[PDB]
Scaffold this active site. Structure first.
Site, mmCIF file in Angstrom:
data_model
loop_
_atom_site.group_PDB
_atom_site.id
_atom_site.type_symbol
_atom_site.label_atom_id
_atom_site.label_comp_id
_atom_site.label_asym_id
_atom_site.label_seq_id
_atom_site.Cartn_x
_atom_site.Cartn_y
_atom_site.Cartn_z
ATOM 1 N N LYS A 1 0.817 -1.212 0.000
ATOM 2 C CA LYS A 1 0.000 0.000 0.000
ATOM 3 C C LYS A 1 0.857 1.271 0.000
ATOM 4 O O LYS A 1 0.566 2.217 -0.734
ATOM 5 C CB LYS A 1 -0.971 -0.021 1.168
ATOM 6 C CG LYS A 1 -1.633 1.308 1.474
ATOM 7 C CD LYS A 1 -2.011 1.349 2.939
ATOM 8 C CE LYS A 1 -2.856 0.143 3.292
ATOM 9 N NZ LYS A 1 -2.568 -0.323 4.664
ATOM 10 N N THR B 1 3.968 1.561 -1.087
ATOM 11 C CA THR B 1 4.604 1.615 -2.389
ATOM 12 C C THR B 1 3.743 2.521 -3.259
ATOM 13 O O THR B 1 4.246 3.428 -3.937
ATOM 14 C CB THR B 1 4.719 0.198 -2.989
ATOM 15 O OG1 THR B 1 5.459 -0.623 -2.082
ATOM 16 C CG2 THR B 1 5.430 0.185 -4.347
ATOM 17 N N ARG C 1 3.388 7.150 8.311
ATOM 18 C CA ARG C 1 3.629 6.839 9.731
ATOM 19 C C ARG C 1 5.082 6.448 9.922
ATOM 20 O O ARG C 1 5.690 5.953 8.977
ATOM 21 C CB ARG C 1 2.745 5.690 10.178
ATOM 22 C CG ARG C 1 1.277 6.042 10.261
ATOM 23 C CD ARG C 1 0.422 4.805 10.100
ATOM 24 N NE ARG C 1 0.637 4.197 8.787
ATOM 25 C CZ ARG C 1 0.352 2.936 8.465
ATOM 26 N NH1 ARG C 1 -0.156 2.092 9.356
ATOM 27 N NH2 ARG C 1 0.579 2.513 7.232
ATOM 28 N N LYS D 1 12.695 -8.411 10.198
ATOM 29 C CA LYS D 1 13.431 -7.518 9.277
ATOM 30 C C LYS D 1 12.743 -6.171 9.093
ATOM 31 O O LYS D 1 11.504 -6.077 9.010
ATOM 32 C CB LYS D 1 13.665 -8.135 7.891
ATOM 33 C CG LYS D 1 15.123 -8.301 7.498
ATOM 34 C CD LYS D 1 15.668 -9.679 7.847
ATOM 35 C CE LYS D 1 16.961 -9.969 7.099
ATOM 36 N NZ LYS D 1 17.755 -11.076 7.706
ATOM 37 N N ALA E 1 -3.194 -0.172 14.336
ATOM 38 C CA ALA E 1 -4.398 0.120 13.574
ATOM 39 C C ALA E 1 -5.596 -0.718 14.036
ATOM 40 O O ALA E 1 -6.704 -0.595 13.502
ATOM 41 C CB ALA E 1 -4.135 -0.039 12.076
ATOM 42 N N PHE F 1 -3.698 -1.310 7.745
ATOM 43 C CA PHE F 1 -4.551 -2.473 7.441
ATOM 44 C C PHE F 1 -5.470 -2.272 6.238
ATOM 45 O O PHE F 1 -5.264 -1.352 5.458
ATOM 46 C CB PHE F 1 -5.401 -2.852 8.649
ATOM 47 C CG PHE F 1 -4.629 -3.393 9.796
ATOM 48 C CD1 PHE F 1 -3.410 -4.004 9.604
ATOM 49 C CD2 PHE F 1 -5.169 -3.334 11.070
ATOM 50 C CE1 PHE F 1 -2.713 -4.526 10.671
ATOM 51 C CE2 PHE F 1 -4.491 -3.866 12.145
ATOM 52 C CZ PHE F 1 -3.262 -4.466 11.945
ATOM 53 N N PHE G 1 2.082 -7.176 -11.231
ATOM 54 C CA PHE G 1 3.018 -8.206 -10.799
ATOM 55 C C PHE G 1 3.415 -9.126 -11.984
ATOM 56 O O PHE G 1 2.574 -9.429 -12.859
ATOM 57 C CB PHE G 1 2.424 -8.969 -9.624
ATOM 58 C CG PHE G 1 3.416 -9.783 -8.884
ATOM 59 C CD1 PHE G 1 4.290 -9.185 -7.984
ATOM 60 C CD2 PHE G 1 3.489 -11.164 -9.087
ATOM 61 C CE1 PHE G 1 5.215 -9.948 -7.291
ATOM 62 C CE2 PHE G 1 4.411 -11.941 -8.390
ATOM 63 C CZ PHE G 1 5.278 -11.326 -7.492
ATOM 64 N N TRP H 1 6.434 0.484 -8.311
ATOM 65 C CA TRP H 1 7.507 -0.298 -7.717
ATOM 66 C C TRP H 1 8.619 -0.398 -8.710
ATOM 67 O O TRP H 1 9.791 -0.125 -8.403
ATOM 68 C CB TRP H 1 7.052 -1.703 -7.282
ATOM 69 C CG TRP H 1 8.166 -2.463 -6.567
ATOM 70 C CD1 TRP H 1 8.537 -2.358 -5.221
ATOM 71 C CD2 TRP H 1 9.134 -3.415 -7.143
ATOM 72 N NE1 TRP H 1 9.615 -3.159 -4.938
ATOM 73 C CE2 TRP H 1 10.018 -3.824 -6.044
ATOM 74 C CE3 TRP H 1 9.343 -3.951 -8.403
ATOM 75 C CZ2 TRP H 1 11.048 -4.739 -6.227
ATOM 76 C CZ3 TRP H 1 10.382 -4.872 -8.574
ATOM 77 C CH2 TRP H 1 11.212 -5.257 -7.509
HETATM 78 N N1 FOL Z 1 7.272 -7.383 -4.276
HETATM 79 C C1 FOL Z 1 7.154 -7.042 -5.582
HETATM 80 N N2 FOL Z 1 6.181 -6.156 -5.946
HETATM 81 C C2 FOL Z 1 6.008 -5.774 -7.241
HETATM 82 O O1 FOL Z 1 5.105 -4.956 -7.528
HETATM 83 C C3 FOL Z 1 6.926 -6.358 -8.280
HETATM 84 N N3 FOL Z 1 6.889 -6.071 -9.616
HETATM 85 C C4 FOL Z 1 7.794 -6.655 -10.467
HETATM 86 C C5 FOL Z 1 7.784 -6.369 -11.963
HETATM 87 N N4 FOL Z 1 6.570 -5.674 -12.360
HETATM 88 C C6 FOL Z 1 5.685 -6.046 -13.332
HETATM 89 C C7 FOL Z 1 4.400 -5.576 -13.145
HETATM 90 C C8 FOL Z 1 3.389 -5.855 -14.057
HETATM 91 C C9 FOL Z 1 3.622 -6.606 -15.195
HETATM 92 C C10 FOL Z 1 2.427 -6.821 -16.109
HETATM 93 O O2 FOL Z 1 1.378 -7.240 -15.632
HETATM 94 N N5 FOL Z 1 2.558 -6.496 -17.405
HETATM 95 C C11 FOL Z 1 1.511 -6.262 -18.405
HETATM 96 C C12 FOL Z 1 0.713 -4.969 -18.175
HETATM 97 C C13 FOL Z 1 -0.779 -5.181 -18.470
HETATM 98 C C14 FOL Z 1 -1.634 -3.928 -18.667
HETATM 99 O O3 FOL Z 1 -1.103 -2.843 -19.012
HETATM 100 O O4 FOL Z 1 -2.877 -4.020 -18.487
HETATM 101 C C15 FOL Z 1 2.153 -6.251 -19.774
HETATM 102 O O5 FOL Z 1 1.469 -5.981 -20.792
HETATM 103 O O6 FOL Z 1 3.379 -6.524 -19.835
HETATM 104 C C16 FOL Z 1 4.927 -7.090 -15.418
HETATM 105 C C17 FOL Z 1 5.953 -6.811 -14.488
HETATM 106 C C18 FOL Z 1 8.755 -7.559 -9.982
HETATM 107 N N6 FOL Z 1 8.824 -7.874 -8.675
HETATM 108 C C19 FOL Z 1 7.960 -7.314 -7.784
HETATM 109 N N7 FOL Z 1 8.010 -7.597 -6.466
#
Ligand code: FOL
Ligand code: FOL
EC number: 6.3.4.3
Lengths: 557, 557
Positions: B72, B74, B95, B106, B274, B302, B382, B410
């Site tokens: 959150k 981030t 906070r 950690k 919280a 939360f 992600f 991120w």
């Molecule tokens: N803890 C953690 N949090 C994160 O947010 C994170 N992000 C990444 C890399 N980030 C990402 C995030 C999104 C996409 C993804 O969903 N790509 C789509 C976008 C879709 C759209 O635009 O609707 C694509 O088209 O590639 C790829 C890599 C690696 N480790 C992480 N680790």
């Protein structure tokens, strides 16, 4: 000591209403007389005064009704009268009784004793034809639904999905479940239906919620009568019945001017059920009263869990009213029933059952606070109530934060309500209200039900049968989910269980069925079985009723 | 591709804060530096700008937290950064983390990846001494309670009724339940007590709710520490500790200026629990941000059932804030857990569990609507999320009525939040908010609990143990019943049952215990057992932690 109700009504000297009307600033040309002592009043009065400020709005309500009786209207009229005696410019607005009860259980006064609107006899019977107009506006749609099928069924209604019943203003149980259109291809389309009492007709509801004849007509056009074989809804609009219905209601849309015993002006207009409808008199009457007067007393059907709730959450919602005070009417007796004492021993002093029962009243007071309206309690004095009893009841009301006033309006007309009047005035000068409805329309039906249920009924949660689930699902996808919600439940309890007197805890509400009135503009969850067409008793009051050569009416009241 | 969190924080180039401060219109004389990259800021800034209008207030919150993580903060930092990139005058308020976690589980970034407030190392550790000041303000009252008994017990406290514990900012479980004052007449009065983590200290809560040092002192004086043998309450006021505590907090009452990676100014100030507190940063920081900036991002502890709720119903209540938008942060993964998928199979595409889980998000969106605040959803992107998945999530958010924006802050700092920023701006220019708290203070504690429970948790009703009943009864007659209510329950469910993921139906809440923070000014119902002093794990992070001759810190993050 006191004469009976009926005879008090006759010996009262009433003033020519046209007099009352010019007294209030209504022009003669805006008046249509019905005798000397009744009049319909033009929607033009309101139209030319739209800009004037509203007087004060004072709602009358009561605690959970019991077999012991509370007399809420008695208080309303008597409160009105006291206000008049104290020199204030006041009207009272009340509902028109259903004709039918006059023949089963007996007709009764609009109020009672010395607190009454007159002429009594007329207001019970045909009065000014408002209910007849409702009956035929309603049944014309019935006959047009039926004619449509007969004439080739172009809209493609599945006759078995028709929800729009028929109505009549007598207590006729045999008319509950019927099959019509029999006899053959020439006689209509055979189908199962029935009658409800006219005052439970959605058209009666609409009248009471409409802002004028054109708003009323537009509502009519939104009435859902049934569905197509495809499950699409069919409305009165689709049948093009609205103009006609609207025509049948051309005189019905005007409030009726009448007076209390002591000649205080009074509107009587509309009068829906308070369980499947909102149990209030027409917005039209009440909105006119606020323009004509500085103070307007009005009341609501059933206990404060229902009438008060719907008054605020529906009536005031639509009309943009902001009530300034609310009077809760209670008796020592009803409270004792709520505290546990059986009907036959209500006379025996019992401070403990009175303290126990007070919970019912405490919980109502509390609810009215949730709408931001300051609350005054009226105690309908009764001869068997001891000083110890009444005193306790005062201490308890004050402890619970509301002014309290003993009312003997029944006994002593406007004079028996002077302290009460003064308490209300006192509350109005020092505790201005902060009105807001209990809930926003943008919630879901289930959200809206739960908020009413838990905030007002003190329910734990809400249950739903499968049939109710699909209804709500259906209604929401048909786009009716942002409507008001109108609980039809027992009035004898905060719970849906009429055996649970006082202030019930740890209970749930079971919504069994959910119906729609898209004309009136709301959603109707039902909890118990709801009787929309009561029956006559073992002996009906009608067996005693007569009128002789003089015109002396016996057996009626 | 991306570097780890910690190293990103070090290689960031930070600007002199005094620079940031003059950039915002803070005068040098209102600044007290802590290095080049931290500063306390005078409560005088606010005082001279009291009249200026507030910028916009944007709350960040999230869906029901899962083991899968949502990130959150981030989002909050990255949202702040995008806003800065789009040329807007913005600050973020966050906070201060508790020191202790840095050694068990950690320490972690304020945010993460490229969305972070810096200097990282300091903000985890001693930062500017705010928590130490809280620790000693708190424990001085502990020592004064104990000294009072020792010195003849004039106020006549029943030592066994003492509720005011001690605090420390490490995870030390052995300190949970202790007996103090042993050794004999010279060593104090023997009694049972314990320690909670400093950030759960009511004094930490007060700081976050106080309007200034004098308001803070006055709160301190209302802290209830225990009772007399007569059952009368004893307060810190009675012990005359407030001036002292107030003195210990003289520097602590000033917000701390710091910056995001990309140099966007940031306040970090206060940081309560919280569950037993409101999980928000200090009113003081946030109120200052609104004067200095046109847009202020802040977040809550939360899920939205808790932080958001308390943010509005407590923080905004006291401060008279009216949030303008709220961003809910969600991930494909957490939603799938809520739809049923175990932690290990979260990578496997599964549109059905995603549709199922979406209910959790739908229900939060809905809640935020109940406060009259327009809602935008942030999707923490992600790498394992498929197009089909994300697309479905968009359709579902739009179907449910909220703008949605994919966020890769991120990964890509402020740039990964530009569409999100634009959506928020878009919502701010076209859907102004209609803020109102969920409930009025004049309700009863049980009314207030039920309204939260049913409106927000979708609970059927509320249960209460006998012990909770007497507490509420006691508290109400002591005159604390018109206080806010602060639910301490699990954060892993809408229910009080942490095993119930998604959108649970047909459940009840059991309030087992009810506690009071009369300093902070609220009532604390607790549902599960609430851990106010967590323990270290099997291996503590502290076993790996080192710093070498260079000062190279390993094992910490
Ligand atoms: N803890 C953690 N949090 C994160 O947010 C994170 N992000 C990444 C890399 N980030 C990402 C995030 C999104 C996409 C993804 O969903 N790509 C789509 C976008 C879709 C759209 O635009 O609707 C694509 O088209 O590639 C790829 C890599 C690696 N480790 C992480 N680790
Ligand atoms: N249906 C019905 N309703 C009534 O209200 C009613 N009232 C009476 C007579 N009314 C009453 C009302 C109150 C007291 C009474 O309680 N008297 C107390 C007043 C106590 C006080 O002021 O606090 C007294 O002192 O006499 C006596 C007679 C007779 N029949 C009725 N019948």
């Amino acid at each position: 000591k006191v004469p009976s109700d009926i005879e008090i009504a006759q010996a009262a000297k009433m003033k020519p209403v046209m007099e009352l009307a010019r007294g209030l600033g209504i022009q003669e040309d805006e008046v249509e007389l019905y005798g000397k002592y009744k009049a319909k009043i033009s929607l033009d009065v309101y139209r030319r005064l739209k800009d004037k400020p509203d007087g004060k709005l004072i709602l009358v309500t009561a605690i959970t009704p019991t077999p012991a009786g509370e007399g809420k209207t008695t208080t309303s009229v008597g409160l009105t009268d006291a206000l008049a005696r104290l020199g204030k410019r006041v009207m009272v607005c009340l509902r028109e009784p259903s004709l039918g009860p006059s023949f089963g259980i007996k007709g009764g006064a609009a109020g009672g004793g010395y607190a009454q609107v007159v002429p009594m006899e007329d207001i019970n019977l045909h009065f000014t034809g408002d209910i007849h107009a409702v009956t035929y506006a309603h049944n014309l749609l019935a006959a047009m639904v039926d004619n449509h099928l007969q004439q080739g069924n172009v809209l493609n209604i599945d006759p078995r999905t028709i929800t729009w019943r028929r109505v009549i203003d007598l207590n006729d149980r045999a008319l509950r479940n019927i099959v019509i259109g029999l006899g053959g291809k020439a006689n209509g389309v055979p189908r199962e239906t029935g009658f409800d009492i006219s005052v439970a007709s959605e058209v009666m509801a609409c009248l009471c919620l409409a802002s004028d004849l054109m708003d009323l007509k537009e509502r009519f056009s939104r009435i859902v009568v049934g569905y197509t074989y495809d499950g699409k809804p069919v409305t009165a609009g689709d049948l093009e019945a609205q103009g006609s219905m609207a025509l049948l209601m051309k005189d019905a849309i005007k409030p009726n001017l009448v007076q209390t015993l002591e000649n205080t002006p009074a509107f009587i207009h509309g009068g829906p059920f308070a369980n499947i409808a909102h149990g209030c008199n027409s917005i039209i009457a009440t909105k006119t009263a606020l323009k004509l007067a500085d103070y307007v007393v009005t009341e609501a059907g059933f206990g404060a869990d229902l009438g008060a709730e719907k008054f605020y959450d529906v009536k005031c919602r639509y009309a943009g009213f902001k009530p300034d005070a609310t009077v809760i009417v209670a008796t020592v007796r009803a409270l004792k029933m709520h505290g546990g004492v059986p009907k036959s021993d209500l006379a025996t002093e019992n401070l403990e059952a009175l303290r126990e029962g007070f919970a019912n009243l405490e919980k109502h007071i509390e609810n009215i606070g949730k709408f931001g309206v300051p609350a005054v309690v009226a105690i309908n004095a009764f001869p068997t109530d001891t000083e110890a009893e009444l005193n306790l009841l005062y201490e308890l009301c004050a402890k619970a934060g509301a002014e309290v006033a003993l009312s003997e309006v029944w006994a002593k007309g406007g004079e028996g309500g002077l302290e009460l009047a003064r308490k209300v005035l006192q509350t109005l000068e020092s505790r201005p209200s902060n009105f807001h409805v209990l809930y926003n329309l943008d919630l879901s039906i289930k959200d809206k039900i739960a908020k009413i249920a838990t905030e007002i009924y003190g329910a734990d949660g809400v249950n739903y049968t499968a049939e109710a689930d699909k209804a709500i699902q259906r209604y929401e996808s048909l786009g009716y989910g942002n409507l008001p919600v109108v609980m039809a439940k027992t009035q004898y309890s905060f719970s849906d269980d009429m055996t649970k007197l006082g202030r019930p805890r740890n209970f749930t509400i079971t919504v069994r069925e959910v119906r729609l009135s898209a004309g009136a503009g709301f959603i109707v969850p039902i909890t118990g079985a709801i009787m929309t067409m009561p029956g006559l008793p073992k002996r009906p009051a009608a067996c005693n009723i007569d009128i002789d050569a003089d015109g002396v009416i016996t057996g009626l009241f």
